[PDB]
Design a protein around this nucleic acid. Structure first.
Ligand SMILES: [K+]
Ligand SMILES: [Mg+2]
Ligand SMILES: [Mg+2]
Ligand SMILES: [Mg+2]
Ligand SMILES: [Mg+2]
Ligand SMILES: [Mg+2]
Ligand SMILES: [Mg+2]
Ligand SMILES: [Mg+2]
Ligand SMILES: [Mg+2]
Ligand SMILES: [Mg+2]
Lengths: 51, 343, 225, 132, 63
RNA sequence: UAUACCGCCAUCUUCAGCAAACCCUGAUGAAGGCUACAAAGUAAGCGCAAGUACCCACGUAAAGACGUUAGGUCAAGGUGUAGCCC
């Protein structure tokens, strides 16, 4: 998946620029996993980090 | 016998069997087709199995300012040359075995949604580098001829668009698929519509139309909604530049009618400015995200009427049962609002 | 630095006047009436789209409204002059064989082009293949008769619109003016009517070309000193 | 349909030389003979040996100058002399051409026991008569 | 480039839009003249249809 | 194994059609495209034709495309695939 294919992308609450890519700029909702293709494991880590 | 040997052209022409009775009326399959291999590619003039070094042909004529004499590579030296030659062949052969990753369209073996690149430049220094072409349908149509019987032809539908409102489509026909692709691509550029985009991301108003037996119902959507429509419509929308829209295709799902119907509706959509001028009234946009703030999107360039539009108590408008049924939560579908990849 | 001034003084200046070439004086409603421009075909030959321009039917003979012809003719002649002033290629098209010789002379006299013969398919939409890759197409096409010899619209009317070429056209009561840019409702059968059209379009073109030479000369003489 | 030595029409993209464009019924009308000797004249002898020599020479020259020949050979015989006229390309270096001319002239003179000369004419590319 | 869809709009509407979109690099010679002195009716293709029922022509007899 | 082919041919042919590249028509469907007092066709190339051989400009030869019959020929020779190697 996009997150797991690049080992240098770290899903951290401080990596605000990476986390922004997974949130809708116009509505602010976190895209569901089928939208971007991230596996359930990484989507769970992303959702927690965004919060 | 030396006198019975033929040339490479004659040997490959016979061994390949490209022209025969098994390749006329779909009589032979395509899997066992063999490819020509030029056996003179890596061969050097003067190089043989004995390893002789001919001054002026295989090796340089003069070395150290003196004419070289006939020499022969040692046994071990020739083995290296022979081993290296085998390695070079394997590498060259390896290159041909490698498969380049081809970006697939709607399906692995489907032509729909594949980019054909920019249209070819005109003969008078004209260029279309901004325009992008994408195939929509590839069909093997047939006619019957007295001499040959079934005559196979290719019908190709392509759509071209620069992504800034200008987009068109055309049909190309030819015996070869390459000729069909070229004809459709180049001809589509001379038949370009201009599509009015509201804020350069969506349509101005909901469009409902019927082209022959195809029903297309498009709805205006806010930013971030995405393209939630028939895949062919998604491809055409990206070429036009529309980012957010919903569309439902009913009736016959003919690709020709769908494309011709889509371009018919998008071309006839009335802009806010065109509405204000026709009505002589301000067009005020009410957004829920902005509360009661009245946003004037268009004003009449001419004189502004002073009489308010008559407010009919009950609108005599034809409602689509499918719309009313959904607003009342009466539409249960296990296929609606399914999670899908970003479009 | 000088190109912008040249264009403004020469190309953009005439576009700021309502009648830069004074084509109003070339014709009057009286002159049109004396040329039988108002005589249309019988009511049974009427084209539906020509009804807004028909004054009425006098004993089943449509009478074209010359009050509209004057305003329509004024706009067509103005557009024609402005195109001739801009050194545009004007092509006269007509398939009426009674006037083929007259129209071919009128074009040669005003330094323009005429096509009065059988129109071969693709002259305009396939020109680069018929003439050559660097051929220049007409900038204006003036139809003195918009119908072919089977009483159907001349094919070039459709092809001119395909090529985005503006068209001026004399449209009788049985013609279809939907695709003609500057339609001029009038009689296209009487020699007097056709002769008047030829004189009017030949004069406007000649005047416009001469005005272009006068304006350019004055700009050059002033430029030096 | 006749087949002998007829390059068949394609899509208009196959370049053919002047010799390849003429079928056998033009061999004395529009094109000439690629070999001139007396064996086939009335009352002349040794036509068989002249033919075997022509067939060999055309194969020897095809393999000796691989990829260089731009058209068919012209074999000429005058008395004891044998003259090979070849139209070659301008890709192989001149040094390699001179080596192959001296080599082929010497090797063939000792094989057929007669003075042999090789006259090379270079062309930038194959001369295209028409596109079939 | 140009647009050969003579049944969609007029020559001016098509040209104006293509010039705006950037497809046409230079507007044609007649474009400026058209805009300054446009015709009374925009030349839009329209299909002639037969009059059915009670529809009649508005042309009146001159008496 | 001619039902993998080259090569050389039969046959319609005692035919005149096969056509790349464009353009237009059908609402941008498979497809179709002529009227000379002409109404959408322009068409490289190939064949016919023309030229050439024989005693003429006649006649006879030669020539005769694209395709049709998986037509004939692995036994002219070459050759893909498979098989044999005391
Ligand atoms: K075999
Ligand atoms: Mg697959
Ligand atoms: Mg008339
Ligand atoms: Mg025969
Ligand atoms: Mg067979
Ligand atoms: Mg004869
Ligand atoms: Mg015969
Ligand atoms: Mg002949
Ligand atoms: Mg058989
Ligand atoms: Mg048999």
């Amino acid at each position: 998946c996009p997150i797991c294919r690049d080992h240098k992308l770290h899903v951290d609450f401080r990596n605000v620029k990476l986390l922004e890519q997974f949130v809708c700029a116009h509505t602010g909702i976190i895209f569901y996993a089928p939208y971007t293709g991230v596996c359930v494991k990484q989507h769970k880590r992303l959702t927690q980090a965004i919060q | 016998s030396f006198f019975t040997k033929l040339t490479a052209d004659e040997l490959w022409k016979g061994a390949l069997a490209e022209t025969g009775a098994g390749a006329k009326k779909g009589r032979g399959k395509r899997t066992k087709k063999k490819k020509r291999k030029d056996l003179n590619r890596g061969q050097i003039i003067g190089e043989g199995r004995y390893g002789f070094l001919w001054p002026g042909l295989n090796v340089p004529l003069m070395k150290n300012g003196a004419v070289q004499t006939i020499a022969q590579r040692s046994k071990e030296e020739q083995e290296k040359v022979e081993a290296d030659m085998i390695q070079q062949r394997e590498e060259w052969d390896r290159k041909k075995k490698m498969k380049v990753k081809r970006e697939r369209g709607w399906s692995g073996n489907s032509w729909g949604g594949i980019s054909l690149g920019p249209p070819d430049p005109g003969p008078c220094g004209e260029t279309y580098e901004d325009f992008d072409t994408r195939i929509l349908e590839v069909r093997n149509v047939f006619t019957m001829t007295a001499k040959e019987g079934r005559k196979k032809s290719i019908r190709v539908l392509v759509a071209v668009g620069n992504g800034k409102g200008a987009a068109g489509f055309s049909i190309g026909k030819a015996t070869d698929r390459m000729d069909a692709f070229r004809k459709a691509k180049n001809r589509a550029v001379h038949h370009l519509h201009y599509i009015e985009r509201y804020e350069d991301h969506t349509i101005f108003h909901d469009i409902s139309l019927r082209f022959k037996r195809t029903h297309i119902k498009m709805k205006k959507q806010p930013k971030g909604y995405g393209l939630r429509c028939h895949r062919a419509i998604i491809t055409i929308c990206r070429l036009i530049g529309i980012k957010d829209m919903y569309a439902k295709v009913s009736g016959s799902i003919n690709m020709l009618s769908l494309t011709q119907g889509l371009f018919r509706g998008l071309s006839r959509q009335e802009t806010h400015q065109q509405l204000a001028d026709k009505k002589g009234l301000h067009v005020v946009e009410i957004r829920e995200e902005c509360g009661p703030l009245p946003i004037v999107v268009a004003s009449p360039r001419g004189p502004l009427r002073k009489d308010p539009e008559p407010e009919d108590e009950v609108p005599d408008v034809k409602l689509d049962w499918e719309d009313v049924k959904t607003a009342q939560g009466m539409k249960r579908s296990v296929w609606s609002n399914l999670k899908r990849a970003a479009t | 630095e000088d190109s912008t001034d040249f264009n403004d003084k020469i190309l953009n200046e005439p576009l700021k006047h309502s009648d830069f070439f004074n084509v109003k004086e070339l014709f009057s409603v009286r002159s049109l009436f004396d040329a039988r421009v108002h005589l249309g075909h019988k009511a049974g030959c009427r084209h539906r789209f020509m009804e807004p321009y028909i004054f009425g039917s006098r004993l089943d003979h449509d009478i074209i409204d010359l009050e509209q012809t004057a305003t329509h003719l004024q706009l067509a002649l103005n557009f024609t002059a402005h195109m001739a002033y801009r050194k545009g290629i004007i092509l006269f098209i007509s398939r009426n064989r009674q006037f083929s010789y007259l129209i071919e002379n009128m074009a040669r006299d005003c330094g323009e082009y005429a096509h009065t013969r059988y129109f071969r398919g693709g002259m305009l939409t396939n020109a680069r293949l018929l003439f050559g890759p660097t051929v220049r197409l007409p900038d204006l096409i003036i139809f003195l008769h918009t119908l072919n010899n089977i009483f159907e619209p001349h094919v070039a009317v459709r092809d001119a619109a395909k090529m985005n070429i503006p068209t001026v056209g004399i449209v009788d009561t049985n013609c279809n003016p939907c695709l003609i840019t500057y339609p001029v409702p009038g009689n296209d059968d009487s020699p007097l009517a056709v002769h008047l059209y030829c004189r009017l379009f030949q004069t406007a073109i000649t005047r416009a070309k001469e005005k272009r030479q006068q304006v350019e000369a004055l700009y050059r003489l002033q430029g030096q000193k | 349909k006749n087949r002998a030595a007829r390059v068949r029409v394609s899509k208009g993209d196959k370049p053919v030389t002047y010799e390849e464009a003429h079928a056998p019924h033009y061999i004395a009308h529009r094109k000439g003979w690629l070999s001139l000797h007396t064996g086939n004249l009335d009352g002349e002898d040794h036509a068989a040996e002249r033919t075997v020599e022509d067939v060999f020479l055309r194969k020897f020259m095809w393999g000796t100058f691989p990829g260089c020949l731009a058209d068919q050979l012209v074999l000429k015989r005058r008395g004891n002399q044998l003259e090979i006229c070849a139209v070659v390309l301008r890709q192989l270096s001149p040094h390699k051409y001179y080596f192959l001319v001296g080599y082929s002239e010497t090797l063939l003179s000792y094989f057929y026991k007669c003075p042999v000369r090789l006259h090379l004419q270079t062309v930038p590319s194959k001369v295209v008569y028409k596109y079939l | 480039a140009g647009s050969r869809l003579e049944t969609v709009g007029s020559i001016f509407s098509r040209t104006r839009d293509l010039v705006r979109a950037g497809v046409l690099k230079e507007k044609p010679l007649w474009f400026d003249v058209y805009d300054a002195f446009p015709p009374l009716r925009e030349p839009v293709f329209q299909r002639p249809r037969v009059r059915y029922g009670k529809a009649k022509a508005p042309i009146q007899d001159i008496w």
